[PDB]
Amino acid sequence: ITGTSTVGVGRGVLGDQKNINTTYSTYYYLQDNTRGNGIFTYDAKYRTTLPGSLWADADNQFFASYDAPAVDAHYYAGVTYDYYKNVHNRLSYDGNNAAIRSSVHYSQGYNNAFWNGSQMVYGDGDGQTFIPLSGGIDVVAHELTHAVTDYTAGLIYQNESGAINEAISDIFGTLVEFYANKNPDWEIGEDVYTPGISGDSLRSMSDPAKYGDPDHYSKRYTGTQDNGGVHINSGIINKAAYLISQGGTHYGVSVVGIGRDKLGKIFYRALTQYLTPTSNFSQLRAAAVQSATDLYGSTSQEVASVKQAFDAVGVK
Ligand SMILES: CC(C)C[C@H](NP(=O)(O)CNC(=O)OCc1ccccc1)C(=O)NCN
Ligand SMILES: [Ca+2]
Ligand SMILES: [Ca+2]
Ligand SMILES: [Ca+2]
Ligand SMILES: [Ca+2]
Ligand SMILES: [Zn+2]
């Protein structure tokens, strides 16, 4: 909408207060004009029609319980935009400052979030498996990263290319969580998953097997559920990424960690310069090796550590 840029205040899903960028034109809208061609947050009103209504508020204060998922979807989309711009010199998901749109209050009891090809969508959860999913900064960044992948490598959402697609979203979701620096970890979704159980998460990158996911190519899932295991076999790549950054000895193979920033540079370059829609795990290894070579040199520790990490997870 046309209006003037304003700053509202509200509370997110976890009860924390934050300022948000809004737009005033009769109402205050969840429309942040400070980033690209805007960040826009919509109310899906418990239905499945998308996007729903651009979020309108009478007083620019967002402290109602119903407001909380919108506050966080809007704010964390801004953090994710800032990460891509400031760290990777990427302007929104398309590289051209495309408007970023999210809908909250999608459906009833909906234990998931997704990118639908055009926008982000967040359920409220059923209150037992999830609380509203935009409360997780890693979740929000996972979703926006699907848009980045779709505009760049274009990894098809099936089998190994789809597991790479998933891992890219977990990797950058985690790197955004570290960028914001509030309780960062190598776990996925912990802030919104299972409110009645402390210390768990949907997936672990540091130890995927904690939640049943493979941590070695020999343990990969080969069936048809979950689009050929895209959220399962992502553990193999998540583990490799974790090892590149943090190091470790895994199935007897030692990896010297090179840190999160270099992990992010290597994988961002692989995603945007070398991967293709049908890349498999072996092709990802080659893309990561080439990316590290471009950035750090063929004889660098960074290249050596990429090779060790893929060796450790059984990907040649
Ligand atoms: C981080 C988690 C809390 C949420 C995450 N959800 P996701 O992996 O973005 C689902 N996307 C999808 O199916 O895209 C496929 C698709 C394509 C077009 C239209 C609709 C759907 C997940 O791990 N969900 C499984 N628990
Ligand atoms: Ca209000
Ligand atoms: Ca965390
Ligand atoms: Ca996390
Ligand atoms: Ca929990
Ligand atoms: Zn995903």
Tab-separated table of C-alpha atoms and ligand atoms in Angstrom:
chain	number	residue	atom	x	y	z
A	1	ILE	CA	0.000	0.000	0.000
A	2	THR	CA	1.017	3.633	-0.466
A	3	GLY	CA	1.664	5.360	2.839
A	4	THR	CA	4.426	6.533	5.127
A	5	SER	CA	6.972	4.369	6.896
A	6	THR	CA	6.389	3.959	10.618
A	7	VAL	CA	7.786	1.927	13.520
A	8	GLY	CA	5.458	-0.159	15.647
A	9	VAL	CA	6.135	-2.272	18.704
A	10	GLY	CA	4.877	-5.673	19.699
A	11	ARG	CA	5.522	-9.051	21.231
A	12	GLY	CA	6.487	-12.218	19.417
A	13	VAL	CA	5.475	-15.849	19.934
A	14	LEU	CA	7.973	-16.314	22.795
A	15	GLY	CA	6.826	-13.164	24.594
A	16	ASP	CA	9.759	-10.959	23.608
A	17	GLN	CA	9.248	-7.314	22.707
A	18	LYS	CA	10.527	-6.007	19.388
A	19	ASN	CA	10.124	-3.017	17.105
A	20	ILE	CA	8.760	-3.617	13.616
A	21	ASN	CA	8.698	-1.582	10.444
A	22	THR	CA	5.131	-0.715	9.440
A	23	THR	CA	3.328	1.570	6.984
A	24	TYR	CA	0.623	4.068	7.926
A	25	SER	CA	-2.332	4.757	5.638
A	26	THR	CA	-5.487	4.974	7.817
A	27	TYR	CA	-4.381	1.701	9.442
A	28	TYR	CA	-0.874	0.587	10.331
A	29	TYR	CA	0.120	-2.285	8.044
A	30	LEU	CA	2.814	-4.946	8.395
A	31	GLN	CA	4.671	-3.480	5.430
A	32	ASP	CA	8.392	-2.768	5.919
A	33	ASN	CA	9.595	-0.306	3.270
A	34	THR	CA	13.164	-0.200	4.600
A	35	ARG	CA	14.253	-3.421	2.851
A	36	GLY	CA	14.221	-3.823	-0.904
A	37	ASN	CA	10.804	-3.531	-2.473
A	38	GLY	CA	9.206	-4.314	0.858
A	39	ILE	CA	8.407	-7.051	3.341
A	40	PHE	CA	4.663	-7.707	3.625
A	41	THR	CA	2.913	-9.886	6.226
A	42	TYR	CA	-0.644	-11.171	5.783
A	43	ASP	CA	-3.394	-12.698	7.925
A	44	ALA	CA	-4.694	-16.009	6.550
A	45	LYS	CA	-7.363	-16.016	9.321
A	46	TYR	CA	-7.180	-19.786	9.982
A	47	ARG	CA	-8.065	-20.520	6.337
A	48	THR	CA	-6.085	-21.896	3.423
A	49	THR	CA	-6.740	-19.165	0.858
A	50	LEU	CA	-3.518	-17.263	0.189
A	51	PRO	CA	-2.212	-14.752	0.852
A	52	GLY	CA	-5.153	-13.487	2.868
A	53	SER	CA	-5.277	-9.870	3.967
A	54	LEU	CA	-2.339	-7.512	4.397
A	55	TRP	CA	-2.067	-7.255	8.162
A	56	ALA	CA	-3.845	-4.111	9.401
A	57	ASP	CA	-3.730	-2.718	12.940
A	58	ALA	CA	-5.445	0.357	14.366
A	59	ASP	CA	-2.729	1.634	16.747
A	60	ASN	CA	0.717	0.295	15.668
A	61	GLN	CA	0.954	-1.798	18.879
A	62	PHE	CA	1.087	-5.558	18.381
A	63	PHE	CA	0.752	-7.115	21.857
A	64	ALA	CA	-2.339	-9.284	21.339
A	65	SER	CA	-1.847	-13.028	21.346
A	66	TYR	CA	-3.269	-13.139	17.803
A	67	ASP	CA	-0.590	-10.643	16.707
A	68	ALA	CA	2.423	-12.643	17.906
A	69	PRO	CA	2.991	-14.917	14.862
A	70	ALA	CA	2.721	-11.905	12.553
A	71	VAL	CA	5.240	-9.887	14.562
A	72	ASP	CA	7.817	-12.678	14.321
A	73	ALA	CA	7.203	-13.589	10.655
A	74	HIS	CA	7.652	-9.919	9.756
A	75	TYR	CA	10.663	-9.242	11.985
A	76	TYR	CA	12.537	-12.455	11.157
A	77	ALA	CA	11.983	-11.948	7.436
A	78	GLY	CA	13.792	-8.644	7.943
A	79	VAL	CA	16.693	-10.324	9.761
A	80	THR	CA	16.969	-12.886	6.966
A	81	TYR	CA	16.930	-10.155	4.306
A	82	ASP	CA	19.711	-8.393	6.215
A	83	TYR	CA	21.791	-11.578	6.403
A	84	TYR	CA	21.638	-12.180	2.662
A	85	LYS	CA	22.325	-8.527	1.810
A	86	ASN	CA	25.062	-7.839	4.369
A	87	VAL	CA	26.854	-11.204	4.256
A	88	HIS	CA	26.352	-12.342	0.639
A	89	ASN	CA	25.549	-9.095	-1.199
A	90	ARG	CA	22.244	-10.654	-2.307
A	91	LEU	CA	19.189	-8.391	-2.590
A	92	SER	CA	16.162	-10.477	-1.587
A	93	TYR	CA	15.491	-13.989	-2.820
A	94	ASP	CA	15.710	-13.143	-6.541
A	95	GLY	CA	18.768	-10.897	-6.256
A	96	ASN	CA	16.654	-7.965	-7.510
A	97	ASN	CA	14.886	-6.933	-4.287
A	98	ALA	CA	11.662	-8.862	-4.906
A	99	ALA	CA	8.976	-8.115	-2.348
A	100	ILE	CA	8.944	-10.710	0.423
A	101	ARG	CA	5.476	-11.909	1.420
A	102	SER	CA	4.429	-14.116	4.339
A	103	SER	CA	1.063	-15.338	5.632
A	104	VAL	CA	0.463	-16.394	9.241
A	105	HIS	CA	-2.489	-18.127	10.891
A	106	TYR	CA	-2.586	-20.562	7.974
A	107	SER	CA	-5.193	-23.297	8.425
A	108	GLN	CA	-6.050	-24.883	11.810
A	109	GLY	CA	-3.662	-26.993	13.877
A	110	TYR	CA	-1.134	-26.811	11.052
A	111	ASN	CA	2.213	-28.236	12.188
A	112	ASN	CA	4.344	-26.881	9.348
A	113	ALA	CA	5.583	-23.930	7.312
A	114	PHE	CA	6.444	-23.698	3.616
A	115	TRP	CA	7.310	-21.610	0.593
A	116	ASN	CA	4.479	-22.099	-1.909
A	117	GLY	CA	6.414	-20.945	-5.001
A	118	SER	CA	5.569	-17.280	-4.340
A	119	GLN	CA	5.407	-16.581	-0.582
A	120	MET	CA	6.085	-17.975	2.896
A	121	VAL	CA	3.276	-19.635	4.854
A	122	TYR	CA	3.195	-20.432	8.588
A	123	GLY	CA	0.869	-22.606	10.592
A	124	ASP	CA	0.011	-21.961	14.220
A	125	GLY	CA	0.773	-25.555	15.173
A	126	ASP	CA	-1.572	-27.649	17.305
A	127	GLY	CA	-0.027	-26.395	20.557
A	128	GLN	CA	1.545	-29.801	21.265
A	129	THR	CA	3.873	-30.612	18.366
A	130	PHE	CA	4.414	-26.926	17.465
A	131	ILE	CA	3.505	-23.441	18.607
A	132	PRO	CA	3.232	-20.835	15.819
A	133	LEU	CA	6.149	-21.639	13.597
A	134	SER	CA	7.274	-18.105	12.754
A	135	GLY	CA	8.561	-17.955	16.337
A	136	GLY	CA	11.675	-19.780	15.118
A	137	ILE	CA	14.214	-17.597	13.356
A	138	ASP	CA	15.799	-20.725	11.870
A	139	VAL	CA	12.348	-21.713	10.553
A	140	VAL	CA	11.728	-18.330	8.914
A	141	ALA	CA	15.180	-18.319	7.333
A	142	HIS	CA	14.719	-21.965	6.251
A	143	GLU	CA	11.569	-20.913	4.387
A	144	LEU	CA	13.036	-17.821	2.708
A	145	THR	CA	16.067	-19.880	1.710
A	146	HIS	CA	13.772	-22.185	-0.289
A	147	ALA	CA	12.953	-19.111	-2.409
A	148	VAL	CA	16.680	-18.376	-2.831
A	149	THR	CA	17.311	-21.978	-3.903
A	150	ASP	CA	14.398	-21.911	-6.331
A	151	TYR	CA	15.734	-18.753	-8.003
A	152	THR	CA	19.335	-20.017	-8.172
A	153	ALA	CA	20.280	-23.717	-8.297
A	154	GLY	CA	16.633	-24.725	-8.682
A	155	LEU	CA	17.144	-28.068	-6.931
A	156	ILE	CA	14.202	-30.352	-7.710
A	157	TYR	CA	12.361	-31.320	-4.521
A	158	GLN	CA	12.909	-35.089	-4.738
A	159	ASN	CA	15.598	-37.652	-3.872
A	160	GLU	CA	19.190	-36.386	-3.546
A	161	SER	CA	18.626	-32.968	-5.162
A	162	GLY	CA	15.714	-32.467	-2.761
A	163	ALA	CA	17.786	-33.477	0.265
A	164	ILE	CA	20.392	-30.922	-0.826
A	165	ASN	CA	17.581	-28.369	-1.166
A	166	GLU	CA	16.502	-29.162	2.403
A	167	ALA	CA	20.031	-29.043	3.784
A	168	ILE	CA	20.654	-25.653	2.154
A	169	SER	CA	17.577	-24.335	3.969
A	170	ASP	CA	18.740	-25.846	7.310
A	171	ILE	CA	22.301	-24.539	6.819
A	172	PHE	CA	21.269	-20.968	6.050
A	173	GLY	CA	18.471	-21.106	8.618
A	174	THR	CA	21.149	-21.909	11.187
A	175	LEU	CA	23.589	-19.301	9.860
A	176	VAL	CA	20.841	-16.652	10.144
A	177	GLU	CA	20.160	-17.821	13.701
A	178	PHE	CA	23.862	-17.319	14.487
A	179	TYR	CA	23.811	-13.933	12.690
A	180	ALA	CA	21.029	-12.714	15.011
A	181	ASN	CA	22.970	-14.272	17.924
A	182	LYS	CA	20.049	-15.167	20.218
A	183	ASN	CA	20.492	-18.663	21.673
A	184	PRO	CA	22.143	-19.952	18.472
A	185	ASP	CA	22.669	-23.649	17.926
A	186	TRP	CA	22.996	-26.303	15.239
A	187	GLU	CA	19.467	-27.619	15.926
A	188	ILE	CA	16.382	-26.890	13.765
A	189	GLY	CA	13.117	-25.534	15.126
A	190	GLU	CA	13.859	-25.854	18.849
A	191	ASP	CA	12.173	-22.543	19.748
A	192	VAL	CA	8.747	-23.627	18.446
A	193	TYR	CA	8.838	-27.446	18.664
A	194	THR	CA	7.105	-29.436	21.453
A	195	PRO	CA	6.464	-26.795	24.123
A	196	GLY	CA	5.988	-29.589	26.670
A	197	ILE	CA	9.445	-31.151	26.063
A	198	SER	CA	12.635	-29.225	26.802
A	199	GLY	CA	15.881	-29.652	24.930
A	200	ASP	CA	14.592	-31.298	21.738
A	201	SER	CA	14.204	-30.089	18.160
A	202	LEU	CA	12.899	-31.227	14.798
A	203	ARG	CA	16.363	-32.055	13.381
A	204	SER	CA	19.952	-31.800	14.551
A	205	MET	CA	22.780	-30.832	12.211
A	206	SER	CA	25.489	-31.681	14.758
A	207	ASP	CA	24.079	-35.180	15.350
A	208	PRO	CA	21.281	-35.972	12.889
A	209	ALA	CA	20.943	-39.474	14.302
A	210	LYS	CA	19.561	-38.004	17.565
A	211	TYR	CA	16.229	-37.746	15.717
A	212	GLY	CA	16.658	-40.792	13.481
A	213	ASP	CA	18.173	-39.079	10.469
A	214	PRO	CA	21.236	-40.489	8.682
A	215	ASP	CA	24.720	-39.111	9.301
A	216	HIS	CA	26.457	-41.188	6.632
A	217	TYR	CA	25.615	-41.967	3.005
A	218	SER	CA	25.512	-45.703	3.797
A	219	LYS	CA	22.460	-44.984	6.014
A	220	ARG	CA	20.516	-43.027	3.391
A	221	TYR	CA	16.807	-43.608	2.903
A	222	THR	CA	15.892	-45.027	-0.492
A	223	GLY	CA	12.073	-45.264	-0.273
A	224	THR	CA	9.346	-42.962	-1.508
A	225	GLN	CA	8.021	-41.254	1.646
A	226	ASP	CA	8.756	-37.537	2.070
A	227	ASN	CA	9.578	-37.049	-1.642
A	228	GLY	CA	12.292	-39.690	-1.356
A	229	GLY	CA	13.435	-38.646	2.116
A	230	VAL	CA	14.223	-34.970	1.524
A	231	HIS	CA	13.931	-34.130	5.248
A	232	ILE	CA	15.715	-37.384	6.212
A	233	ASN	CA	18.712	-37.562	3.879
A	234	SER	CA	19.314	-33.859	4.496
A	235	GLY	CA	21.038	-35.138	7.646
A	236	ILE	CA	23.974	-36.408	5.583
A	237	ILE	CA	24.629	-32.951	4.133
A	238	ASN	CA	23.786	-31.122	7.367
A	239	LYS	CA	26.395	-33.263	9.125
A	240	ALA	CA	29.001	-32.465	6.467
A	241	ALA	CA	28.256	-28.743	6.817
A	242	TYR	CA	28.486	-28.948	10.607
A	243	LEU	CA	31.860	-30.711	10.305
A	244	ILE	CA	33.212	-28.143	7.838
A	245	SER	CA	32.366	-25.343	10.273
A	246	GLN	CA	33.001	-26.910	13.688
A	247	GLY	CA	35.275	-29.867	12.970
A	248	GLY	CA	35.201	-33.298	14.560
A	249	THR	CA	36.084	-36.929	14.024
A	250	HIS	CA	33.152	-38.857	12.577
A	251	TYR	CA	33.304	-42.573	11.766
A	252	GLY	CA	37.050	-42.252	12.306
A	253	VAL	CA	37.565	-39.416	9.768
A	254	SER	CA	38.943	-36.187	11.255
A	255	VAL	CA	37.811	-32.784	9.982
A	256	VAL	CA	39.500	-29.498	10.902
A	257	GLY	CA	36.793	-26.873	11.344
A	258	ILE	CA	37.042	-23.600	9.433
A	259	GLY	CA	34.137	-21.730	11.079
A	260	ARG	CA	30.631	-20.620	10.169
A	261	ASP	CA	31.490	-17.649	7.984
A	262	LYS	CA	33.627	-19.713	5.615
A	263	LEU	CA	31.003	-22.482	5.584
A	264	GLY	CA	28.444	-19.895	4.497
A	265	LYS	CA	30.710	-18.457	1.790
A	266	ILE	CA	31.468	-21.910	0.368
A	267	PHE	CA	27.857	-23.094	0.313
A	268	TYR	CA	26.487	-19.780	-0.970
A	269	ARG	CA	28.939	-19.892	-3.872
A	270	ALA	CA	28.147	-23.546	-4.558
A	271	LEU	CA	24.402	-22.812	-4.546
A	272	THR	CA	24.618	-19.795	-6.831
A	273	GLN	CA	27.439	-20.745	-9.220
A	274	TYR	CA	27.711	-24.521	-9.505
A	275	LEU	CA	24.622	-26.491	-8.451
A	276	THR	CA	21.892	-27.313	-10.958
A	277	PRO	CA	18.318	-28.558	-10.565
A	278	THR	CA	19.377	-32.209	-10.664
A	279	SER	CA	22.625	-32.116	-8.669
A	280	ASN	CA	23.240	-35.184	-6.520
A	281	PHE	CA	25.361	-35.482	-3.380
A	282	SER	CA	28.561	-36.295	-5.291
A	283	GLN	CA	27.979	-33.218	-7.468
A	284	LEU	CA	27.446	-31.111	-4.344
A	285	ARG	CA	30.821	-32.284	-3.034
A	286	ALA	CA	32.439	-31.233	-6.304
A	287	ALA	CA	30.659	-27.867	-6.222
A	288	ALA	CA	31.790	-27.232	-2.634
A	289	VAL	CA	35.380	-28.218	-3.461
A	290	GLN	CA	35.401	-25.889	-6.468
A	291	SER	CA	33.818	-23.058	-4.447
A	292	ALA	CA	36.398	-23.380	-1.667
A	293	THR	CA	39.147	-23.485	-4.288
A	294	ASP	CA	37.851	-20.254	-5.860
A	295	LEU	CA	37.637	-18.507	-2.481
A	296	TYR	CA	40.703	-19.830	-0.637
A	297	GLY	CA	43.018	-21.613	-3.091
A	298	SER	CA	43.603	-25.218	-4.087
A	299	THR	CA	46.182	-25.854	-1.341
A	300	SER	CA	44.122	-24.212	1.417
A	301	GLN	CA	42.941	-25.724	4.658
A	302	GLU	CA	39.419	-24.786	3.583
A	303	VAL	CA	39.566	-27.078	0.530
A	304	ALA	CA	41.147	-29.877	2.568
A	305	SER	CA	38.398	-29.630	5.200
A	306	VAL	CA	35.588	-29.741	2.617
A	307	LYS	CA	37.069	-32.996	1.303
A	308	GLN	CA	37.467	-34.481	4.796
A	309	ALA	CA	33.886	-33.592	5.742
A	310	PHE	CA	32.381	-35.240	2.672
A	311	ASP	CA	34.658	-38.259	3.221
A	312	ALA	CA	33.412	-38.452	6.823
A	313	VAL	CA	29.793	-38.735	5.636
A	314	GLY	CA	30.615	-41.203	2.850
A	315	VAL	CA	30.100	-38.898	-0.155
A	316	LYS	CA	32.749	-39.231	-2.863
B	1	LIG	C1	11.771	-25.910	9.384
B	1	LIG	C2	10.502	-26.718	9.646
B	1	LIG	C3	9.840	-26.256	10.933
B	1	LIG	C4	9.533	-26.621	8.476
B	1	LIG	C5	9.997	-27.339	7.204
B	1	LIG	N1	8.992	-27.138	6.157
B	1	LIG	P1	9.458	-27.091	4.557
B	1	LIG	O1	10.661	-28.000	4.412
B	1	LIG	O2	9.759	-25.716	4.030
B	1	LIG	C6	8.019	-27.775	3.642
B	1	LIG	N2	8.130	-27.421	2.262
B	1	LIG	C7	7.630	-28.198	1.214
B	1	LIG	O3	7.029	-29.212	1.382
B	1	LIG	O4	7.923	-27.605	0.002
B	1	LIG	C8	7.347	-28.161	-1.145
B	1	LIG	C9	6.241	-27.267	-1.666
B	1	LIG	C10	6.333	-26.696	-2.940
B	1	LIG	C11	5.316	-25.885	-3.420
B	1	LIG	C12	4.207	-25.640	-2.649
B	1	LIG	C13	4.118	-26.184	-1.382
B	1	LIG	C14	5.125	-26.989	-0.894
B	1	LIG	C15	10.160	-28.813	7.538
B	1	LIG	O5	11.192	-29.304	7.885
B	1	LIG	N3	8.969	-29.564	7.490
B	1	LIG	C16	8.886	-30.964	7.857
B	1	LIG	N4	8.759	-31.100	9.258
B	2	CA	CA	-2.908	-2.989	17.922
B	3	CA	CA	18.374	-21.572	19.066
B	4	CA	CA	18.165	-23.537	15.812
B	5	CA	CA	10.459	-28.765	22.717
B	6	ZN	ZN	12.334	-27.111	3.839
